[PDB]
Design an enzyme around this catalytic site. Sequence first.
Site, PDB file in Angstrom:
ATOM      1  N   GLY A  28       0.833  -1.188   0.000  1.00 32.91           N
ATOM      2  CA  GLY A  28       0.000   0.000   0.000  1.00 32.91           C
ATOM      3  C   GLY A  28       0.868   1.237   0.000  1.00 32.91           C
ATOM      4  O   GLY A  28       2.039   1.198   0.393  1.00 32.91           O
ATOM      5  N   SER A  29       0.278   2.335  -0.464  1.00 28.31           N
ATOM      6  CA  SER A  29       0.949   3.631  -0.472  1.00 28.31           C
ATOM      7  C   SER A  29      -0.010   4.653   0.140  1.00 28.31           C
ATOM      8  O   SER A  29      -0.984   4.310   0.821  1.00 28.31           O
ATOM      9  CB  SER A  29       1.398   3.991  -1.892  1.00 28.31           C
ATOM     10  OG  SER A  29       1.354   5.388  -2.111  1.00 28.31           O
ATOM     11  N   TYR A  32       1.042   9.214   3.864  1.00 28.68           N
ATOM     12  CA  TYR A  32       2.002   8.962   4.934  1.00 28.68           C
ATOM     13  C   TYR A  32       3.323   8.399   4.419  1.00 28.68           C
ATOM     14  O   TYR A  32       4.361   8.585   5.065  1.00 28.68           O
ATOM     15  CB  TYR A  32       1.361   7.998   5.938  1.00 28.68           C
ATOM     16  CG  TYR A  32       0.910   6.703   5.273  1.00 28.68           C
ATOM     17  CD1 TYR A  32       1.791   5.643   5.080  1.00 28.68           C
ATOM     18  CD2 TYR A  32      -0.394   6.563   4.797  1.00 28.68           C
ATOM     19  CE1 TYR A  32       1.380   4.464   4.454  1.00 28.68           C
ATOM     20  CE2 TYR A  32      -0.813   5.391   4.172  1.00 28.68           C
ATOM     21  CZ  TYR A  32       0.079   4.344   4.003  1.00 28.68           C
ATOM     22  OH  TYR A  32      -0.313   3.173   3.381  1.00 28.68           O
ATOM     23  N   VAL A  35       4.155   1.259   2.241  1.00 27.30           N
ATOM     24  CA  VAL A  35       4.350   0.053   3.035  1.00 27.30           C
ATOM     25  C   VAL A  35       4.739  -1.120   2.139  1.00 27.30           C
ATOM     26  O   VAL A  35       4.210  -1.288   1.035  1.00 27.30           O
ATOM     27  CB  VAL A  35       3.107  -0.286   3.879  1.00 27.30           C
ATOM     28  CG1 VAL A  35       3.400  -1.465   4.779  1.00 27.30           C
ATOM     29  CG2 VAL A  35       2.710   0.919   4.734  1.00 27.30           C
ATOM     30  N   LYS A  50       7.299   0.330   6.771  1.00 27.11           N
ATOM     31  CA  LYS A  50       6.733   1.554   6.234  1.00 27.11           C
ATOM     32  C   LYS A  50       7.858   2.562   6.080  1.00 27.11           C
ATOM     33  O   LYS A  50       8.558   2.863   7.044  1.00 27.11           O
ATOM     34  CB  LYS A  50       5.632   2.121   7.135  1.00 27.11           C
ATOM     35  CG  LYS A  50       5.231   3.540   6.763  1.00 27.11           C
ATOM     36  CD  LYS A  50       3.834   3.906   7.283  1.00 27.11           C
ATOM     37  CE  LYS A  50       3.892   4.389   8.728  1.00 27.11           C
ATOM     38  NZ  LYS A  50       2.780   3.849   9.583  1.00 27.11           N
ATOM     39  N   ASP A 165      -2.686   1.872  14.303  1.00 32.39           N
ATOM     40  CA  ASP A 165      -2.678   3.249  13.815  1.00 32.39           C
ATOM     41  C   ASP A 165      -2.548   4.273  14.927  1.00 32.39           C
ATOM     42  O   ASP A 165      -1.433   4.680  15.272  1.00 32.39           O
ATOM     43  CB  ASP A 165      -3.935   3.547  13.004  1.00 32.39           C
ATOM     44  CG  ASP A 165      -3.830   3.068  11.568  1.00 32.39           C
ATOM     45  OD1 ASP A 165      -2.910   2.264  11.256  1.00 32.39           O
ATOM     46  OD2 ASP A 165      -4.680   3.497  10.753  1.00 32.39           O
TER      47      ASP A 165
END
EC number: 2.7.11.24
Length: 350
Positions: A28-29, A32, A35, A50, A165
Amino acid sequence: ERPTFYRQELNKTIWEVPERYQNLSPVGSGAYGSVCAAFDTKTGLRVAVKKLSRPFQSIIHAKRTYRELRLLKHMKHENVIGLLDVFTPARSLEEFNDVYLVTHLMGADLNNIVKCQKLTDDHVQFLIYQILRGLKYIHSADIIHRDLKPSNLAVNEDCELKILDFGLARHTDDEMTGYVATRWYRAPEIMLNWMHYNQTVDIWSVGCIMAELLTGRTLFPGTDHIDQLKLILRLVGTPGAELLKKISSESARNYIQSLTQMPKMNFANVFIGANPLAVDLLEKMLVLDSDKRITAAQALAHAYFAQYHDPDDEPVADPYDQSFESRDLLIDEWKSLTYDEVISFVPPPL
Ligand SMILES: *c1c(OC)c(OC)cc2nc(NC(=O)c3csc(COc4ccc(F)cc4)n3)sc12
């Protein structure tokens, strides 16, 4: 003590990581950063790595980088995500630019779950028990998650749950508008900016999550802020004068008072079939006046959890010094604070 790093082009940026981490594949992007999943050959764990994006771009960014690191280094609890590792390829503060954070790879979140089975009551008991166990810990450090929702809860195959999170300081106004799960679990006082909020917002969220586990349906799926408020008030009743006094903005009170008064609904008739003890707990979590909501420590001792409650296995957190949240520092100063936290990291004995 430096391990050897190696480089890899990966997503769209060059990743430089210690050789212990193998088989990186992007997962995932976002804003932030990015990852990658990897295998930590030194521990045998599947991990998420990350790479922070623009960590020291602005004073706000730099401070948020420091806050995330401080928060992750602090969390040491079975029901809360902890930091396996943090590293930078730089050898000195002068060449420091990138931060990589390594945590447990978690597959399924609570969303994936409410969508593939009708949880038994004992499943709901055990899941919410663990959330409140993690929340008792988090709150004992005067940390507020502020963003509890199903997608923030990892659940492995043995039904073990981890809170993930933490609301760092994200949430754009556009990401909160309309028919979006980003707002459905939020306490109304945060939603409409009624007052200075505190850790009791997280218990409201737990009430919304619990109700959804029991019904399989979102409790307050509003189409916008005001629609969602009407859905909330229809269940829990309109505010009385005591809670109205605590709403700081003359305008919110003025709008509140425009509404036709409504009594609180009978929860046994809303949650048909539910364990009477689940219903009872929901009534204590989903209280409009945040002062009156059950706390996480109090909820753990509620009879709904008698199966799992163990007062000697519900630990509290070490003190967490958040005085930095009040400090005004320059980009360079936050960066240096962050570098110190990176190089002082001690791996968990786990
Ligand atoms: C709980 C749960 O959350 C309330 C969900 O939703 C993700 C699923 C779920 N599935 C369960 N079933 C078992 O845990 C099970 C099947 S065989 C068995 C005994 O032996 C094993 C086999 C394989 C393992 F990896 C562990 C144990 N347990 S409970 C639950």
